[PDB]
Amino acid sequence: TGFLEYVLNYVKKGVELGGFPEDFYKILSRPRRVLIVNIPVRLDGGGFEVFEGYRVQHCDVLGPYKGGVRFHPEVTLADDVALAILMTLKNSLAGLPYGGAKGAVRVDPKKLSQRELEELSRGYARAIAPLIGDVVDIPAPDVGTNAQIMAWMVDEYSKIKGYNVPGVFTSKPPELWGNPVREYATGFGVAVATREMAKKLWGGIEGKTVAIQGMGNVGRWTAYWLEKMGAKVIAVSDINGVAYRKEGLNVELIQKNKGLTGPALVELFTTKDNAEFVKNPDAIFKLDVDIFVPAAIENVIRGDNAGLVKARLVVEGANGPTTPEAERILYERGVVVVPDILANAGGVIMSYLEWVENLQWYIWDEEETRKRLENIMVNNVERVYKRWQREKGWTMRDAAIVTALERIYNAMKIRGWI
Amino acid sequence: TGFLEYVLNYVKKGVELGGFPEDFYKILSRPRRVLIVNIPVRLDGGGFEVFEGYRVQHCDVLGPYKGGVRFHPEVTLADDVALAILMTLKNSLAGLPYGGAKGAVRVDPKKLSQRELEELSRGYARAIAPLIGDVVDIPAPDVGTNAQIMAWMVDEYSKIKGYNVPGVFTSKPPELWGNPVREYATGFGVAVATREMAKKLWGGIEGKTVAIQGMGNVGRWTAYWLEKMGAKVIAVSDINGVAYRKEGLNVELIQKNKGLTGPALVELFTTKDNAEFVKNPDAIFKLDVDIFVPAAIENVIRGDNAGLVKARLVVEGANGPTTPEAERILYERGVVVVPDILANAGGVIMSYLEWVENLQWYIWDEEETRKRLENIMVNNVERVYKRWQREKGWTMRDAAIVTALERIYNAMKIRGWI
Amino acid sequence: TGFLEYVLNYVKKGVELGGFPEDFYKILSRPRRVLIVNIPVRLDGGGFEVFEGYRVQHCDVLGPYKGGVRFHPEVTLADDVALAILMTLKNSLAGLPYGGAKGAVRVDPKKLSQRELEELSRGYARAIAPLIGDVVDIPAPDVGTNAQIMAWMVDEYSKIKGYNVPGVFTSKPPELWGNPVREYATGFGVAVATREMAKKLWGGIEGKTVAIQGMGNVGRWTAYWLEKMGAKVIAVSDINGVAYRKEGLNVELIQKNKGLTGPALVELFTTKDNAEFVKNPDAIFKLDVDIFVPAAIENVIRGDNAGLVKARLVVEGANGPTTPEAERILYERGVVVVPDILANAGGVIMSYLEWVENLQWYIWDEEETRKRLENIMVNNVERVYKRWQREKGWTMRDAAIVTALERIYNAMKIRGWI
Amino acid sequence: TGFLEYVLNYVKKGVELGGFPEDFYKILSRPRRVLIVNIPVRLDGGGFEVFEGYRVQHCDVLGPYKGGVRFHPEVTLADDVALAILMTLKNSLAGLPYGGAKGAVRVDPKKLSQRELEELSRGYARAIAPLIGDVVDIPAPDVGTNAQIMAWMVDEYSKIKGYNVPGVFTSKPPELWGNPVREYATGFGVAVATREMAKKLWGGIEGKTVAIQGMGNVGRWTAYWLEKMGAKVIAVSDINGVAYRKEGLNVELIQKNKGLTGPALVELFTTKDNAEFVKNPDAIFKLDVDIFVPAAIENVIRGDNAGLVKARLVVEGANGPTTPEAERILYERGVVVVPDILANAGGVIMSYLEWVENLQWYIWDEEETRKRLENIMVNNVERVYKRWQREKGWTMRDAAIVTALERIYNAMKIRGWI
C-alpha cells in the first residue's frame, strides 16, 4: 500500500490536470479482475510446498492485457496492482493496443533447482490459464523470470490447448518463436527517443555530447545506437568509475562484447580503447555534456545533486531516476527531462511487435523490426510534444501522464463505460 | 483474520486426531483459487460506484465447488476463505460430490434500489462467469442474498451462454426450476438426524420430549417434522418468550401458518392451542426435556450456563450454539451433542438434490425429494457414529471433522494429489 | 492377426445366418477410427523411453465407444482391432447404447515403478484425450490395467478440461465416483444368466448341482450368488485342486473372506468346511453335475475332452472356454452351451450403470444398482432365447451373434449408413 | 519398412555427426500421433466400398504439422511415416515454423468417377477433421491429389466449422484463396539456390552453363528463372531426347507456351529454335557444363555413370536423383552436389507463404511473394553452407541434415521435451 499510494497519487494528480470526472478515476483505481492461486509443487528433494501466486488484470479498453510476471520472495498484491496500473498508462502512452496487467509468485528462484523451477513455472501458467491467452492476456518476463521460464510456460499452455500457441507469451527465445531485436529494444528505443528530442530542440543530435549512466542492458545499448545516429558518447559510467573521451568513446566495441558485463565493459574503454578512467560513479553528473542518460537505477538525479547537472537534456533510461523535487529544480535552469515512461517504453513496443508476428506466424528481419519499433517511438514523442508545448507550467512528465490518461478516457467514453 | 486463524486451528485439531501427514494440511490450509472482481454499477442518483466482490474456491476432489455468496458491508476475504474451508468439510461429511467455495460482495443491499441490486447481481455473475458452471462451481444464497438474487444471476449467465443453464445456481424459486422442499429442508434434516441419534441411544424417538429454541426457518420446521417422527414437542421459544404444553404443542398450526414470523408463532401456540407462557426466552434451557434443539443464535450455551441444561441430548440446528468449554462440561456429564456440520446439513444436501434435478431437466415430487434427503442424512449419521464409537475420549464433533477430513484425504491420494 | 482373421469369420458367420447384405460386413470389418500415439516417459531410475500406445474405435451406431485399455508387452494392433469388433457385438447384445472400442500400451507394468506407471498412465490419457469423452469414448481397465490406473487417467483428463469429468473412465475407485456393486458384477450376471436358462429347460434352478471352475473374480462370486438363487454348488477348482461336497459348499464363506486369492479359497473350503480335497484341477470336468461353469481361462473344453463333460447345461463365465470343435460335439449330445458374450456381459452392463450415474452425479445404493443389473441381463437372455428356438440347427452361439448383428444393422439402415 | 529403415538410418548418421544424445533419436524416431480411418463410399452404379486412409503427424515443435496427402493404391503406413520424418527435417531446414506430417489414402483415383472421387476426398477431410486445422495440421497435395481435391477438402471442412477456414489446406486453386506463384515455386527456388551456390564457389552465375534434366514442372521453371539470373541454359532434356545450343536456349518459349508438357516443349526447342536434337536422352550426361540439374526422377546419377558428369556443380531438382555411392565418387572428384532437401524446398516454402496469407486474409502480388520466397531460400543456403565449411569430411547433404536436426533439437531442449 506504500508504492500503491504513490501511483494512486500519480494518476489522481494527472486527472486533476486533465479535468477528468471523478468517475474516471474510480474505474482506474481498482483492477478489473484479480486471480489469486496456490501452486502445489513436490520438491525433488523433500516433500511438499504450495506457492502463492496471482495475476493482476487491471484495464481493458485499448486491447488485451499486457504485463510481466515477477518471481521474488518479497512480493505483495498492492505493489503489483500498483505496477499493473503503471503498465496500463505505459502501453496507452506507447500507442499500443494493449491493456495492463502484472503477475507474480512469492518464491526465491535461487532456492529451486531446474526441475523445481520449471515445475513451478508450468504450475503457475496452468493455474491462471483459464484467464490468459494470446488475445486476452499475454504475460511477459520480469525480475525473477526470464526468456527460459517463459518458454516453459508457452509450452505448458500449448499442451493444454493441444496446439502451439506462440502469442500467449512474449520475449521468448529466438529458437522458440522470438525476435532477436529484443536484446537492444529498450536501448534502441532510448536512442530514438532522444534523437527526436534534439531534432526539435537543437535541430539534430548530430555531433552532440552524451553522458550515459550504467552500462547494463539499457545504457550499454543506448550508447551504441546513439552514435550510429550521430551522437558522441564521451562518458559511460558504472559501479566502478567512468570512461571519458573528448573525441568520443568507441562504442562499436560493445557489439563484440555483448557479454562483457557492465562493470568490465567500462574497463574495456580504459584497457583496450584509450580512455580516461576516473574511478567514481558520481562524475558523469557534473561532467560538461550535452545529454545525460541515467540508465542505471532510481533516485540518481536528486535535489541535493541537481545543481551538479550540466546537461541541457536528460533522457531517463532507468526507471524513475530523477526525483519530483529535482524535476522542478532542473526545469528551472533550462535542463529538460524526458519522461522515462515514454523513453524506455521501447521494451513494451518490442513485445508488441513480437506478439504481432506470432499471430500471423511470420518473423520479420532485424532491419524490418527496428524500423517499426522506431516508427512507433518517433510517433509517440511527436504526440507528447504538441500537448507539452500547448500548455504552460506543464512539464514533459505531466504532458505524458495526461496524454496517456486521455487515450484511456477516450476509449472508455466511446465504448460507453462511463 | 481472527476467524480464519480459528478455522485453521480447528482443522489442525482434526488433522492430528485422524493422523494424516502435514502435507495434507498444507493443501487444505490455503484455497485452490480466488477471483477478486470489481464491478461498476450505475446508481439511480448520480451515476457511478465500483463494488468489491470475489469468489473463493477452496477444494475439488469430491466434485465441483459449492457455496453461497455473502452481500454484506463488513466482509473480508480471510473470513470468507475460512467459510469455504468449512463448506468443504461440510460437503464431504454430507456425502455430497461437492467441493466447497464461498463468495462475497462488500455492499449493503438495504441501501441499493431494486434496480441497482439487480444490476449488481448480474455484474457479479458476469464478472465471475468464466470460473463457474453447473459442473465447475455452483454458487448459492447466503446472508445478504436470497432466491430472487439467484434468479437474476441464473438468467444473466444464461444470456451469456446463449441458452438455459438451471444448474449453475441453487436455491432458486420453485417457479424457476427450484424444488419446494427447500422451505423445510434443514429442519426436516435436523429432525431426521435427531431421530436417528435417539434410536442408537434410547432405542426409539417416540415418546421422547423435545424443546426447540427459535421459531425461525430451522426451528419451526424442526418442531413440525419431529412430531411426525414420534417426538413430543412440548416447548418452543423465540425473542418474545416461551410456549409450554405438557400434553405437547400442536405443530400442525405451523404448516397452516408458515411465514407467520417466528415470535408470532409463539403467541399463536398460546392463543389458538392452549399453552403456558413465560416472558423469558431463556427458560427453555431450564426445562427438564429429553432433547434440546438450539435453532436460533450462536454462543447460546456457554460455560456460564452449561450446568443449567437438563436435556440428555443436544442437537445443533444453528451454527455454533455450544461453546468449546460448555461442550466438554456437558460431555463429561453424559450429555451428548450432535454437531451442526452434520445436523443442519439438510440445507446443503437439498441444494445437491436440486442441482442433480437440474442436470437432467427433471424435478421429482416432494415425497421423492424427501426420501432421498432422509436417506443421505441417515447414512451420514451412521458414518459419524460408527467412528465415534471406535475411538475413546472423542466427541461427536471430533468424529465429524475426522470423518469429513478423511474422505478428502483418500480422494487426494487416489487422484495423485498427495 | 490370427485372432483377427478368426473374429472376422466369427462375424461373417453371423452375417450369412441372419442374411444381411455383404455391404454390412464391409463396414463392420474395418474400424471407423484408430489413434496411435507414442508417449515419452522419463524413467525415474534412468533417463528416457518412448512407449507405443493406441486406441481403436470400432463402431458408433448404438452410442459412444466403450472398451478397455491393455497394459501388456505382447500387445499387437490386429488383436485389439479384433477385440474391438467383439466388444461392439457384445455391447449390442448386452442391450446398451454403446459402440465398443479397445486400447493398449505395449509395456510390462510390472517392470515400471509406481511413479513411472502413473506418468505413463497420465500420458496415455493425455495423448488420446482429443478423441475421448464421457459421450464419445469411455475407456476402462483390462489386463495390465486396474482401478488405480483408471483414477490417474480420470484425474489427468480432468486437469485438461479444467473441471471434474467422472463419466470419462469407468471401473474407478468407489471413493472416486465409482460403484461397489462392480466387485461382483460379472459373477452376479453369470448367476442370473444360468438361473434364467434353468427356468427354460428345467423350470427352475432350485436344487441343481453346480460345478464352478476357478475361484478368481468371476467364479468366486458366481458360486456365491448362485446359491442365493436356490442352486447348490458341490465343486470348485483352481490351480491347487478341487473342493467337493455333495451336501453343498458353504459359499457364505466367500463373502466373509473375500480377497483371499483363488487357491487359498479352495483350501478354506477344506479347513472351515468339510469339503473333500482332490489334488487335480481336471476333476470338475469328470463330475456328474447339472450345471458346469468354466470361469478360469480359454480352451478349457477342447475336442479331446468334450465327451468327458457330464453337465447337461454349460454356462461360460470365462472368455472362450469352449473350443469350436468341442462346441460342435458338446451340442450333438444334448448339452447346451450358453455363450460367453451373453453370460459374462455382467461386467460391461455394470460399467454402463456406473457411467449413467456419473452423468447425473448421483450414486445409487447397492440394492438399486443390483436390481437394475439383473433386469438388463434377464431381458438379454430372454431376447436371445426367442431367436434361438425360432431356428433349427442354430446354437446359442449363433442366436447370440445374430441377435447382435441385427441391432447394429437396423441402426445403420435407420441412420442411412448402408 | 525398407524405405522406413532407410530413412531411419539416413537420420541416424545426422544424430552422430551432430553429437546429440540418443534420447533425441528416441523421440524423433517415432511419430507423435497417427490417425488411421476407414471412409465408406457408395459407388455409382456399384454398391459399397470402404477405403483406408491415415494421417501421420510426426513432430510439432517448430510449429503446426505440415505435409501432403497421397492417393495411391500401393501405399503403406511405414513409407508414409518415413516421408513424414523427412518432411519434419525439410521444414526445419526451410526455416519454416512447420512440423512435419504426411497423409495417404489407398486408392487409384484413375478408376473412380468425379462424384466418387469427391465423396472420398470429403470423407477423408471429414474423418481426420478433429486432428487438423489452420494452426494444428495443414495438409497439402501430393501424388494422387491436386488443387481440385484440396478445394473439396477445404469446403468440407468449412461446412463443419460453420465458416470459411481457408488456411487449413494449401496449394488450393487461385480462385480459392490461393497464390499463382505456386506454379513455378519449386523451380524458382532451385534456381535461386544454385545462383547463390555459384557466388560462393565462383562469384556469379552470369555466363555459367546449365544443363537440366526433364522439362516437367520443376526443370522447366528452373531453366526460365535461371537464365534471368545470368545463366545460360544450353541443354534441356526429357523422355523424347535432348536440345543443345551453346549460344543459349531462349526460355521465353516456356512462359509463352506454358502447359505444353515436358517432351513437347523439347521439340518446340528443336522447331522454334535452331537447337540440335539427339534421340538418346542419356546424352545430357556428356555435355560439358558448369552446372547440371537432375529434375526428372530418382536413381539418375548412380555408381555406373557417376564418373562421367562434367559439371563442377550439381543441383538436385528431383528427389533423390544422386545415388549414395555416386555421391562418394562425385565428391572425391571435386564435384559439389546441392542437397534436394534444400534445393527443391521452394515449393514447401511457397506453401508457407500461402498459409500466412490465409491467416490474415490478404493475398500479396507475385513480386511480393517472390521476394519473400527468394529471401528465405537464400538464407537457408547460407546457414547450410556456413556450417558445411566449419567441418571437414562433411558433404553438403551432411551439413544440411545436421543443420536441420539442430533447429529441432534446440527447440526440444528449451521446451523441456529432452
Ligand SMILES: NC(=O)c1ccc[n+]([C@@H]2O[C@H](COP(=O)([O-])OP(=O)(O)OC[C@H]3O[C@@H](n4cnc5c(N)ncnc54)[C@H](O)[C@@H]3O)[C@@H](O)[C@H]2O)c1
Ligand atoms: N530492458 C529492461 O529490462 C528495461 C525496460 C524497463 C525499464 N528499464 C529500467 O532500466 C534500469 C536498469 O535496467 P538494465 O536492464 O540496464 O539493468 P542492468 O541490471 O542490466 O544494469 C544496471 C547497471 O547499473 C549499474 N549501476 C548500479 N549502481 C550504479 C550507480 N550508483 N551508478 C552508476 N551505475 C550503477 C550496474 O553496475 C549495472 O551495470 C531499471 O530501473 C529498469 O527498470 C529496463
Ligand SMILES: NC(=O)c1ccc[n+]([C@@H]2O[C@H](COP(=O)([O-])OP(=O)(O)OC[C@H]3O[C@@H](n4cnc5c(N)ncnc54)[C@H](O)[C@@H]3O)[C@@H](O)[C@H]2O)c1
Ligand atoms: N436453513 C438455513 O438457512 C440454515 C442452514 C445452516 C445453518 N442454520 C443456522 O440456523 C440459525 C437460524 O437460521 P434460520 O434460517 O432459522 O434463521 P431465522 O432468521 O429464520 O430464525 C432465527 C430465529 O431465532 C430467533 N431468535 C434469536 N435469538 C433468540 C433467543 N435468544 N431465543 C429464542 N429465539 C431467538 C429469532 O427471533 C428468529 O425467529 C442460523 O445460525 C443459521 O446460520 C440455518
Ligand SMILES: NC(=O)c1ccc[n+]([C@@H]2O[C@H](COP(=O)([O-])OP(=O)(O)OC[C@H]3O[C@@H](n4cnc5c(N)ncnc54)[C@H](O)[C@@H]3O)[C@@H](O)[C@H]2O)c1
Ligand atoms: N470380471 C471380469 O473382469 C470379466 C469380464 C469379462 C470376461 N471375464 C473373463 O473371465 C476369465 C477369468 O477372469 P477373472 O477376473 O475371474 O480372473 P482371476 O484372475 O480373478 O481368476 C482366475 C482364476 O483361474 C484359476 N485358474 C487358472 N488356470 C486354471 C485351471 N487350469 N483350472 C482351474 N482354475 C484355473 C486361477 O488360479 C485363478 O484363481 C477371463 O478370461 C476374463 O476375460 C471376466
Ligand SMILES: NC(=O)c1ccc[n+]([C@@H]2O[C@H](COP(=O)([O-])OP(=O)(O)OC[C@H]3O[C@@H](n4cnc5c(N)ncnc54)[C@H](O)[C@@H]3O)[C@@H](O)[C@H]2O)c1
Ligand atoms: N514442384 C514439386 O511439386 C516438387 C517439390 C518436391 C520435389 N520435386 C520432385 O521433382 C520430381 C519431378 O517433379 P516435376 O514436378 O518436375 O514432375 P513432372 O512429372 O511434372 O515432370 C517430370 C519430367 O521428367 C521427365 N522424365 C522422366 N524420366 C526421364 C529421363 N530418364 N530423362 C529425361 N526426362 C525424364 C518426364 O517425361 C517429365 O516431363 C519428383 O520426384 C518430385 O517429387 C517436385
